[PDB]
Write a protein that binds this ligand. Structure first.
Ligand SMILES: Nc1ncnc2[nH]cnc12
Length: 278
């Protein structure tokens, strides 16, 4: 304790909830691009820099979701090292937080940021509806939160539903091309009927095994010992991911993992800084 720089993002990505599917894809791609360690890719997918050892989380960026081109943002506070959502900012200026005492002068929303906290189990993910209206409503309900009012059970219930929706349509979208592609597939022009959708089991598993999938691809990059054949990608069948090429098409941006024979935390951060990363 406590978190550092929440007020000073390394960049801000902005999205208009009424904008085109292509603009959403551009929005997501830009986040991954700005998060990347320039010195570390795996199969031409970006890898996040390691989490800095011996300090509290000090690298953040903001995402702004807007009702319209001129509306003011619902601001999300997200870690630039593991893309964790920890805070959001309502219209009256109140930073709300998902971890007690994490963010400077923030107010604990009343519930945790984990899928078990928000839903009740990691396997309820395949029940959450996403889409343009779900996104807009989630943005509204959060941005409409005021520093005064009674955390009614009903109000909390709606709020957990909202965070679950945005985590999926922003955070998990940044992490996974499957998720981002799914969300982009839900976004249509006005001339198309409104649409909703829930992620399938492969994406649920992917979302629940980001570290595992990241680590699994990272192992294929390790150069092998003498006399042993080089490493083969090891399938995560529940994820529908059986090959390295499939893993690369699935990963939006990889979490940094220390794998045996791969980059260490110190070394990857060293390469990150040498390439101009901040
Ligand atoms: N609170 C949270 N923030 C970011 N990613 C998450 N994945 C699951 N829960 C999350």
């Amino acid at each position: 304790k406590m978190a550092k720089n929440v007020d000073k993002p390394l960049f801000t990505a902005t999205f208009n909830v009424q904008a085109s599917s292509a603009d959403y894809a551009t929005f997501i791609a830009g986040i991954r691009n700005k998060l990347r360690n320039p010195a570390h890719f795996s199969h031409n997918r970006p890898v996040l820099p390691p989490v800095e050892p011996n300090v509290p989380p000090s690298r953040w960026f903001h995402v702004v979701l807007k009702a319209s081109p001129t509306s003011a943002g619902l601001t999300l506070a997200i870690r630039a090292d593991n893309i964790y959502l920890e805070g959001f900012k309502s219209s009256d200026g109140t930073w709300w937080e998902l971890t007690p005492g994490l963010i400077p002068g923030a107010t604990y929303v009343g519930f945790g940021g984990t899928y078990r906290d928000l839903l009740g189990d990691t396997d309820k993910l395949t029940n959450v509806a996403l889409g343009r209206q779900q996104l807009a409503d989630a943005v509204t309900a959060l941005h409409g939160r005021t520093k005064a009012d009674k955390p009614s059970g009903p109000k909390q219930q709606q709020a957990r539903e909202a965070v679950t929706t945005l985590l999926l349509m922003v955070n998990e979208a940044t992490r996974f091309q499957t998720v981002s592609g799914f969300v982009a597939g839900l976004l249509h022009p006005k001339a198309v009927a409104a649409a909703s959708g829930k992620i399938g089991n492969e994406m649920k598993a992917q979302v629940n095994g980001w570290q595992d999938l990241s680590a699994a691809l990272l192992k294929t990059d390790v150069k092998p010992p003498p006399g042993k054949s080089p490493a083969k990608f090891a399938p995560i069948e529940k994820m529908g991911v059986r090959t390295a090429v499939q893993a690369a098409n699935t990963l939006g941006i990889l979490l940094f993992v220390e794998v045996p024979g791969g980059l260490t935390v110190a070394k990857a951060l060293e390469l990150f800084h040498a390439s101009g990363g901040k």
